[PDB]
Each structure stands twice: as structure tokens, then as C-alpha cells.
Amino acid sequence: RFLKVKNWETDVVLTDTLHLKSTLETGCTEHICMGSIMLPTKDQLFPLAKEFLDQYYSSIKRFGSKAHMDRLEEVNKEIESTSTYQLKDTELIYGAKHAWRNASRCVGRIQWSKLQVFDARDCTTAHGMFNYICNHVKYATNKGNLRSAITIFPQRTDGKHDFRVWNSQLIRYAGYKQPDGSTLGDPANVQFTEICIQQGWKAPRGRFDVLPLLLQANGNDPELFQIPPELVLEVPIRHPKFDWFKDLGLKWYGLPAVSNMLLEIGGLEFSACPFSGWYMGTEIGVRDYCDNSRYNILEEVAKKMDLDMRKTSSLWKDQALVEINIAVLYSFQSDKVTIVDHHSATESFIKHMENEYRCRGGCPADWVWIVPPMSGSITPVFHQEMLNYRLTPSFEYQPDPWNTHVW
Amino acid sequence: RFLKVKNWETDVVLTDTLHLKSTLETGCTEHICMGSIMLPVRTKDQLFPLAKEFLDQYYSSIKRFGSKAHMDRLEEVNKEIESTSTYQLKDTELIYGAKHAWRNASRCVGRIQWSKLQVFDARDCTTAHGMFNYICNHVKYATNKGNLRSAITIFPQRTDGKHDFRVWNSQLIRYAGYKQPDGSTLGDPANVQFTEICIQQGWKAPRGRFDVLPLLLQANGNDPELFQIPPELVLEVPIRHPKFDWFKDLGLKWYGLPAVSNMLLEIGGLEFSACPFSGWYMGTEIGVRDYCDNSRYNILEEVAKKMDLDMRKTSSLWKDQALVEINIAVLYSFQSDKVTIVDHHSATESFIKHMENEYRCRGGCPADWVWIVPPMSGSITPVFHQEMLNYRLTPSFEYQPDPWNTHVWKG
Ligand code: HEM
Ligand code: HEM
Ligand SMILES: Fc1cccc(CCCNCc2ccnc(-n3ccnc3)n2)c1
Ligand SMILES: Fc1cccc(CCCNCc2ccnc(-n3ccnc3)n2)c1
Ligand SMILES: C[C@H](O)[C@H](O)[C@H]1CNc2nc(N)[nH]c(=O)c2N1
Ligand SMILES: C[C@H](O)[C@H](O)[C@H]1CNc2nc(N)[nH]c(=O)c2N1
Ligand SMILES: [Zn+2]
Numbered sequence: 001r002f003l004k005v006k007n008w009e010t011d012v013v014l015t016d017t018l019h020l021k022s023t024l025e026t027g028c029t030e031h032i033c034m035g036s037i038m039l040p041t042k043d044q045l046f047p048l049a050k051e052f053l054d055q056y057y058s059s060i061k062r063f064g065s066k067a068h069m070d071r072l073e074e075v076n077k078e079i080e081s082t083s084t085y086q087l088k089d090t091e092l093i094y095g096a097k098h099a100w101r102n103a104s105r106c107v108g109r110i111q112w113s114k115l116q117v118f119d120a121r122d123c124t125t126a127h128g129m130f131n132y133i134c135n136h137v138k139y140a141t142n143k144g145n146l147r148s149a150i151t152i153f154p155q156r157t158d159g160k161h162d163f164r165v166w167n168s169q170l171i172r173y174a175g176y177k178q179p180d181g182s183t184l185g186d187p188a189n190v191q192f193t194e195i196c197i198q199q200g201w202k203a204p205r206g207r208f209d210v211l212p213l214l215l216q217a218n219g220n221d222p223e224l225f226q227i228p229p230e231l232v233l234e235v236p237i238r239h240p241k242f243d244w245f246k247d248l249g250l251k252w253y254g255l256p257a258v259s260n261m262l263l264e265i266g267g268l269e270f271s272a273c274p275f276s277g278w279y280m281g282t283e284i285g286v287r288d289y290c291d292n293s294r295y296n297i298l299e300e301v302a303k304k305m306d307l308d309m310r311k312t313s314s315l316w317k318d319q320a321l322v323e324i325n326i327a328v329l330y331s332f333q334s335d336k337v338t339i340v341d342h343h344s345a346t347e348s349f350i351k352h353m354e355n356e357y358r359c360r361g362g363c364p365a366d367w368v369w370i371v372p373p374m375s376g377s378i379t380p381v382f383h384q385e386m387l388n389y390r391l392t393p394s395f396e397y398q399p400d401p402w403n404t405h406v407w
Numbered sequence: 408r409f410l411k412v413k414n415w416e417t418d419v420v421l422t423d424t425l426h427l428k429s430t431l432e433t434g435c436t437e438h439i440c441m442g443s444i445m446l447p448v449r450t451k452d453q454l455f456p457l458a459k460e461f462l463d464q465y466y467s468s469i470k471r472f473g474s475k476a477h478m479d480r481l482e483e484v485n486k487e488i489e490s491t492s493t494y495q496l497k498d499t500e501l502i503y504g505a506k507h508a509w510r511n512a513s514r515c516v517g518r519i520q521w522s523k524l525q526v527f528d529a530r531d532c533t534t535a536h537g538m539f540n541y542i543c544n545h546v547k548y549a550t551n552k553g554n555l556r557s558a559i560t561i562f563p564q565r566t567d568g569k570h571d572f573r574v575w576n577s578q579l580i581r582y583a584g585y586k587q588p589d590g591s592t593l594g595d596p597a598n599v600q601f602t603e604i605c606i607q608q609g610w611k612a613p614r615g616r617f618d619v620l621p622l623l624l625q626a627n628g629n630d631p632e633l634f635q636i637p638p639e640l641v642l643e644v645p646i647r648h649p650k651f652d653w654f655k656d657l658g659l660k661w662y663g664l665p666a667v668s669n670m671l672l673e674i675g676g677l678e679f680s681a682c683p684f685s686g687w688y689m690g691t692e693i694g695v696r697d698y699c700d701n702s703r704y705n706i707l708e709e710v711a712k713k714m715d716l717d718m719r720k721t722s723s724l725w726k727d728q729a730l731v732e733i734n735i736a737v738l739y740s741f742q743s744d745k746v747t748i749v750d751h752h753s754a755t756e757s758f759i760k761h762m763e764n765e766y767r768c769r770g771g772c773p774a775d776w777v778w779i780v781p782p783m784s785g786s787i788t789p790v791f792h793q794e795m796l797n798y799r800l801t802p803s804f805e806y807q808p809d810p811w812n813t814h815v816w817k818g
Contacts, residue, residue: 035442367443373786
């Protein structure tokens with residue numbers, strides 16, 4: 001019931017008690033750990049509401065107060081008659097920040113409390129959704145000095161009138177499969193691209209074509225909009241030593257913005273709730289560029305560096321990997337766009353973990369996702385034991401809309 | 408209940424039925440995953456189920472299940488337990504046992520090799536001098552002049568837990584660490600505690616950076632005793648770099664034989680508290696962990712200095728840059744001296760092939776992702792992208808408290 005976590009590099013030991021408030025289930029049992037699986041009513045709703053308001057009022061040191069009880073009273077009256085309820089602005093802001101505080105896979109949470117929340121609960125059409133999105137984009141980008149943000153569309157009601165952004169990120173490159181057999185652009189988005197096309201996009205069939213938003217308001221069929229090109233800040237990728245690197249033709253976008261998740265606050269589900277912060281270098285250099293089923297550029301880069309590609313034991317992949325990643329960080333920094341390296345970012349998260357241990361009594365964390373996908377054991381998080389559990393409010397995954405949407 | 412795992416790079420889906428035979432706990436619940444936590448005298452009562460269980464598997468594997476030979480063996484072990492309270496394994500069962508414990512070891516990336524394991528039965532051993540002699544033969548046979556061979560040596564099982572055989576070293580071969588009065592450490596910081604024990608026990612420490620430690624051996628519950636492995640039996644490799652000539656001048660070497668001496672082998676309820684096993688190194692255990700952990704030799708600084716990297720800001724990735732070089736140097740040194748070693752690309756690829764095979768033949772392969780994924784270049788190895796189920800099968804290797812915490816001193 002009172003669990004310990006040890007850092008094997010510093011012997012610091014922390015006691016986790018927050019896990020005792022674990023609301024949701026893990027996937028794991030005593031018989032089987034699922035630690036590495038990517039994805040494992042009026043009655044229901046009032047307890048969720050109560051648990052949330054309870055934390056809310058606790059956080060502002062008004063727990064058990066007249067104002068606390070009146071709010072419970074009030075939400076309760078509202079569910080009873082209306083079968084749902086609405087969050088006070090303040091509660092919505094606290095909900096969103098805590099959804100982020102609680103994301104056990106996010107290395108960037110030392111930042112959790114400076115989230116800028118944009119309430120779009122008055123939005124009613126896709127055209128409004130488009131407008132709210134562009135403002136989020138522009139506000140967050142901030143000419144390269146990026147700032148965290150979330151934009152929250154109306155909550156689910158009867159599930160026939162959902163708001164959804166069909167893109168998985170606000171900004172992503174398209175993907176086109178050739179007769180030639182291979183793939184042009186991002187193989188991650190091949191399917192979504194086809195939906196853009198079957199829904200009418202005029203794709204320019206290039207390697208780095210920013211996708212159009214496919215927006216769905218109030219259960220309606222989704223509609224297409226291009227993001228003002230001038231709002232999509234991009235970085236050309238150069239190397240500070242290899243002059244030939246620029247010839248590889250590589251750019252990435254500055255603004256990482258997840259748009260397919262579902263935000264759950266005290267029982268309510270915001271199914272369109274795009275959020276954004278800023279990149280840790282490896283996300284692009286290691287994952288986007290080098291994943292075999294992504295841009296997969298390792299072999300091309302290794303060749304330019306003239307490494308012995310005959311045998312895996314030369315570590316040519318490893319050499320190239322490092323250079324690619326130096327070139328990402330370098331390019332963002334030169335163009336003055338916010339980026340964090342995996343050393344600095346994992347070290348922040350260790351400071352953050354202790355804070356949270358000390359102030360909250362814990363910090364749910366998923367080691368499989370927090371350890372960077374290169375140089376693992378030389379970042380501190382590698383030596384850090386982590387307990388993973390599910391707290392609410394939370395961001396959750398949800399099925400891709402082309403499987404659910406009744407046309 | 409079927410369970411599916413997915414590879415996110417290739418889209419292969421596998422189906423695990425094996426986890427259905429899992430008995431031991433994991434440390435997780437529906438409300439907590441302890442997947443990144445390093446760590447989680449037996450009655451008649453418990454013992455027969457565990458024996459029966461094991462012997463049904465043994466007999467299945469040899470296609471003799473339900474044979475007269477199967478029945479009689481149950482019969483025999485049965486009587487033996489309630490009369491002597493324990494029992495003795497046949498040779499073939501001990502072998503099968505040892506093999507399966509490796510096969511079941513979810514944190515071992517080397518398991519494609521599980522069926523080629525040389526088992527040495529030291530169950531007739533009775534003294535520490537006998538243990539030393541057994542261990543020497545193991546080192547020499549496994550080393551095989553650099554052409555390394557997997558092996559394990561099995562000392563007698565626990566009885567009342569007052570008579571245990573233990574190897575006090577955590578590995579048969581490892582380097583001394585010496586904390587200095589100024590606060591620094593000479594040699595391997597990981598072994599400072601054990602080193603002090605050895606000194607206290609009578610070892611004259613040379614006090615250099617790469618001093619092979621004396622074996623410290625306990626037989627039959629007795630206080631343990633110091634022996635030096637004959638240096639001629641200890642294969643070592645000097646570390647140099649194919650292109651950097653200043654690399655040799657760092658003074659690095661490592662030993663060739665990775666040999667775990669501190670674990671507990673459980674087979675049909677029997678506990679073998681001394682059971683050193685050895686394979687061959689994946690390059691990263693040395694290049695990444697031993698050399699580059701901050702809590703170990705911690706050489707990144709000095710290596711990056713010599714490559715004259717920009718060390719003023721971590722976003723140079725000078726750490727990552729030195730790290731590749733060191734690992735290249737290790738793989739190159741070993742290969743050049745014809746001492747067996749495997750790089751992490753090659754090791755993880757073989758492991759994926761093993762794991763698929765296991766699903767097809769055995770209906771599963773328990774695997775610990777946190778441990779299987781290498782500690783550099785995680786995502787450019789195919790294991791990163793592999794979903795794994797982790798669960799505990801017997802026979803298995805278990806952890807056990809360090810013997811100096813538990814041993815009753817005789818005097
Ligand atoms: C401030 C800079 C931020 C950094 C450096 C950062 C870093 C990361 C990283 C590296 C991951 C793993 C994602 C991957 O490998 O695809 C991640 C996941 C995540 N982050 Fe962040 N993050 C930041 C901001 C935010 C914000 C503003 C939110 C929400 C308001 C958020 C919520 C999450 C969630 C929910 C995940 C898990 C996503 C999933 O399961 O696919 N993060 N973060
Ligand atoms: C044949 C060559 C082998 C290779 C390349 C290999 C590779 C590895 C590696 C890299 C680890 C993680 C090491 C660490 O980080 O401490 C490991 C762990 C392990 N291996 Fe092997 N292994 C081999 C042979 C064996 C053998 C012969 C056995 C037993 C018969 C074995 C049983 C284990 C066990 C039980 C662990 C887990 C150790 C722990 O929990 O501390 N391996 N193996
Ligand atoms: F194919 C998949 C199915 C489900 C999850 C997956 C991994 C999530 C990848 N997206 C996470 C992501 C992407 C960009 N940016 C962020 N981000 C930005 C700030 N914090 C997180 N996060 C792949
Ligand atoms: F400080 C610690 C406490 C508990 C475990 C730890 C790491 C396990 C290190 N031993 C694993 C190891 C070492 C050498 N060789 C092998 N090996 C050989 C074959 N299979 C594994 N394994 C550190
Ligand atoms: C199978 C495994 O769960 C999967 O590859 C995970 C591993 N760790 C990860 N870690 C991060 N940060 N992001 C990811 O997408 C993944 N993928
Ligand atoms: C806390 C964490 O579990 C610990 O650092 C683990 C992580 N993965 C590992 N993986 C291997 N192979 N060996 C290790 O010692 C560790 N250490
Ligand atoms: Zn688990």
C-alpha cells in the first residue's frame with residue numbers, strides 16, 4: 001500500500017502513496033505484466049463528478065466548505081434533470097492541467113501547470129473548429145518561442161453529436177503509396193491521406209505536403225480546410241559539420257500537436273481536445289526520420305558519411321543515428337524554434353518526479369515511454385524506477401473516427 | 408484465454424497461450440504496473456505439487472507422458488518426499504531443468520541459445536575447495552580459448568536452509584572496487600562492498616583499476632573461503648579503437664567471460680542456491696553499462712575530451728557521440744582477439760526470430776521489454792517495436808539476498 005521506488009544510479013528512494021487513489025485499470029494482473037502493450041449513465045456520472053469536485057475544492061483549500069457542498073449540490077441537481085452537467089471555467093482549467101499532470105507517458109510534465117487552456121465549448125460548426133484551431137496554432141507557435149496549449153471543444157452528449165478532429169496531429173506530412181510499390185512522404189498517414197482524397201483534397205503528391213484538417217462538428221460529416229501555410233512554421237534540416245546534409249532534402253514542422261485524444265474530466269468526455277507543446281529532439285531525429293516504417297533515412301545517410309555498411313558490428317546505424325539527431329537539434333536552435341534534447345528533458349523530469357513525490361506523494365510514470373529511444377542508459381530516467389497507474393482527469397485513446405462515424 | 412502481441416514496425420500479430428501455465432506472481436495488479444521495478448525451508452505440503460508439475464512437463468517434453476516410466480517416477484519421488492522430505496533429481500531431469508530455466512528467463516536476450524547449454528552437475532560437491540575446483544573447470548571449459556561455450560555448474564540443493572552452498576561473488580569474474588579516503592573510487596564502484604569483505608576475509612588487494620577478485624565460497628552452510636582463480640584461466644581483452652590510436656592509451660580492458668554467480672535455480676520445488684552460469688557478452692553490457700554508467704567506470708568525460716567534442720552544451724550530443732565510439736571499440740577489440748561477443752543489432756534480431764519460433768512451437772515466450780531493449784539505440788533495434796508479455800514460468804532463475812546479509816557466522 002505504501003510503495004517505494006529506487007534510483008539505481010543515486011540510491012534516492014521515494015515513497016509513492018498517490019497510487020492509492022488509482023481510479024482506472026492498468027492492463028496488468030499478478031499473473032501477467034502488460035507494461036509494453038501500446039494500447040490495452042446517470043448513476044456512473046455522479047460519482048465521477050463528485051470525485052473530481054472533491055479534488056478541485058481540495059486543491060483550492062476549500063474542501064468541505066459551504067461553497068464546496070453547494071457546488072456538489074448543484075451539479076447533482078443538474079445531472080438529475082439534465083443527465084449531464086457543465087464545468088465552471090475554473091474547473092475546466094484545473095481539469096485540463098491535471099489531465100496533463102497525470103499523463104504517465106509524458107516526459108514534459110515539469111511544465112504541467114503553465115498550460116494555456118482555450119475554451120471552445122461554444123463552437124457549433126466545423127468552420128468555427130477551423131477558426132479555433134488556427135488561433136491555437138498561431139498562439140502556440142508564437143514565432144518559434146513555443147507555448148503549451150489545449151483547445152477544448154464541446155463535451156460528448158449522447159455520442160451521436162461528437163466533436164472530432166480526424167487528424168492524429170494538427171500538423172503532419174501526407175503519405176502516398178506508389179504503383180512503383182514504395183511510399184512517398186510519411187507512411188504513417190497513408191490511410192488518412194486517402195480519406196482526405198476520397199473526401200476531396202487536391203493532394204500535390206510531394207514528400208512533405210502538410211495535410212488538410214478534417215473536422216467534425218456535432219456528429220456531422222467532417223469537412224476539409226487547409227491551415228494557412230503561413231501559420232505552419234517549418235525547419236529545413238542542416239548539419240553543423242556535414243555540408244552535404246542539406247541536400248538530403250529534409251524538413252520538419254515546429255509544432256507538435258496531438259489531436260486524436262479524448263480528455264476525461266470528472267465524468268465528462270471531450271473527444272476533440274487538441275493539445276500541443278514542443279519537441280524533444282529524438283521524437284523527430286530518432287522516430288520520424290529513422291523508424292523503419294517512417295522516413296527510414298538511415299541507409300541513405302550512412303552512405304553519405306561513407307561508413308562501413310558491410311557488417312552490423314561497425315555500428316554504422318548508431319553513428320548515423322547520432323548525426324541525424326545532432327542535425328535536428330542544430331537546425332531548430334539555429335532557426336530559433338523551441339526544441340529540447342533528451343538529456344536536458346529527462347533530467348527535468350527527474351526534478352519533476354521528486355517535486356511530485358514531495359508535494360503530491362507520487363507521480364505516475366511509464367518507463368517504457370519515458371526512456372528516450374536512443375542512449376537510454378545515459379539519461380537518468382533509465383536508472384529510475386517508476387510506478388505506472390491511471391489517475392483522473394486523463395487523456396485517453398479512442399477509435400479512429402472512420403471506423404465509428406455513421407455517414 | 409488467448410493474448411495477442413503486435414509488432415508496430417512489421418505488423419506481425421502473435422498469440423500467447425503459454426501465459427496460462429504461469430504460476431508465480433508479477434508484482435503488478437489491475438491498479439499498478441511494476442514493470443520497471445528492479446526486484447519483486449519449504450514443507451512436504453507444498454513440495455509434491457511442485458514436483459508433480461515439473462515431472463509432467465519433463466515427461467511431456469520426452470513424449471512419455473502417462474508412461475509406466477512416468478507413473479513410477481511420480482510414485483518414487485512421492486515416497487521420497489514424505490520419507491526424506493525432499494527428493495533428488497535424475498541427471499536428465501537436472502539437465503532439462505537447467506535448460507528450461509534459461510528458456511524461461513524473460514530478461515535474457517540470449518535465449519535463442521537455450522538448448523545448447525552445457526550443464527555441470529556438481530551435486531556431489533561437499534567443500535569450498537571442491538567448489539573452487541568445479542568453478543575453475545567451468546571457467547576453463549566455457550572460455551574455450553575465446554571461442555566461448557554456454558555452461559552452468561549446479562551445486563547441491565538447499566535442505567534445511569542451514570546448509571546452503573553459495574558463491575558470494577555476484578559474477579565469477581569481476582574487478583575489485585576500492586573507495587578512497589578523498590571520496591573517489593579506484594576500479595569498479597559496483598563491487599566496493601564485496602571487495603571490502605574479501606579484504607576483511609584475508610585477500611591482499613593489489614589496489615589497481617582492473618584487479619580480478621578472489622572467489623569467495625561457502626559450502627554446506629560453512630563460513631566461506633577465499634581462492635584466487637588462476638590468472639592463466641582468466642581471459643581478458645585490451646580495449647582499442649579501429650581508427651583512434653589514443654584509445655588504447657586510456658588503459659581499458661575487460662574480461663571475456665560473463666558469469667552470473669548469485670542467482671537461485673528453482674526446479675520442481677528444489678532450490679539450488681549456487682548455480683553459476685555463463686554465456687558470452689552482448690557488446691553493450693560493457694561499452695554502455697560497465698564503462699559509461701555514472702555509477703561504474705564512468706569514462707564518457709575522458710573519451711569525449713580526447714575526441715575534443717563540444718562538451719559545453721549537452722545538445723552537441725557529445726555524450727551520445729563518445730558512447731558510439733566506445734562501443735565500436737569494444738566490438739572491435741573482442742573480434743580482433745577472436746573472443747566471442749555479439750552486437751546489439753545482431754542479438755535483438757536473433758531474439759525476435761527466437762521469439763516468433765517460441766510462439767509457433769511453445770505458444771509463447773515471456774519477455775521483459777525493459778530489460779530486452781538495449782541501453783543505446785533502442786528504437787533502431789527491432790525489439791523496441793515489439794510488444795511483449797512478461798510473466799513467470801518455472802523452472803526459473805530467481806534473485807536471492809546477498810549472503811553477507813543472511814549468513815550465520817561460525818567463527
Ligand atoms: C511541453 C513540452 C512537452 C514535451 C517535451 C512533451 C514530451 C512528450 C513525449 C516525448 C511523449 C511521448 C510521445 C511520443 O513518443 O509520441 C509525450 C507523450 C504525451 N504527452 Fe507530452 N510533452 C509536452 C507537452 C504536453 C502537453 C502540453 C500535453 C497535454 C496538455 C501533453 C500530454 C502528453 C500525452 C497524453 C502523451 C502520451 C500520448 C500518447 O499516449 O500517444 N504533453 N510527451
Ligand atoms: C549465450 C549468450 C548470452 C547472451 C548474449 C545473454 C544476454 C543477456 C543480457 C544482455 C542480459 C541482461 C544482462 C544485464 O543487463 O545484466 C541477460 C540476462 C540474463 N540472462 Fe543471459 N545471455 C546469454 C546466456 C545466458 C545463459 C547461459 C543463461 C543461463 C543459463 C542466461 C540467463 C540470463 C538471466 C537469468 C538473465 C537475467 C539476469 C538478471 O535478472 O539479473 N543467459 N542475458
Ligand atoms: F500508431 C499509434 C497508435 C497509438 C499511439 C501511437 C503513438 C503516439 C504518437 N503521437 C504521440 C505524440 C505525437 C506528437 N506530439 C506529441 N506530444 C506533443 C507533446 N506531448 C506529446 N505526442 C501510435
Ligand atoms: F545493482 C544491481 C542489482 C541487481 C541486478 C543488477 C543488474 C544485473 C547484472 N547482472 C546481469 C549479468 C551480468 C553479467 N552477465 C550476465 N549474463 C550472462 C548471461 N546472461 C546474463 N548477466 C544490478
Ligand atoms: C511495443 C512498445 O510498447 C512500443 O514500441 C513503444 C515503446 N516505447 C515508446 N516510447 C515512446 N516515447 N513512444 C513510443 O511510441 C514508444 N513505442
Ligand atoms: C529502474 C530500471 O528498471 C533499471 O534501470 C533497469 C532498466 N533496464 C535494464 N536492462 C538491463 N538489461 N539491465 C539493467 O540493469 C537494467 N536496469
Ligand atoms: Zn505491469
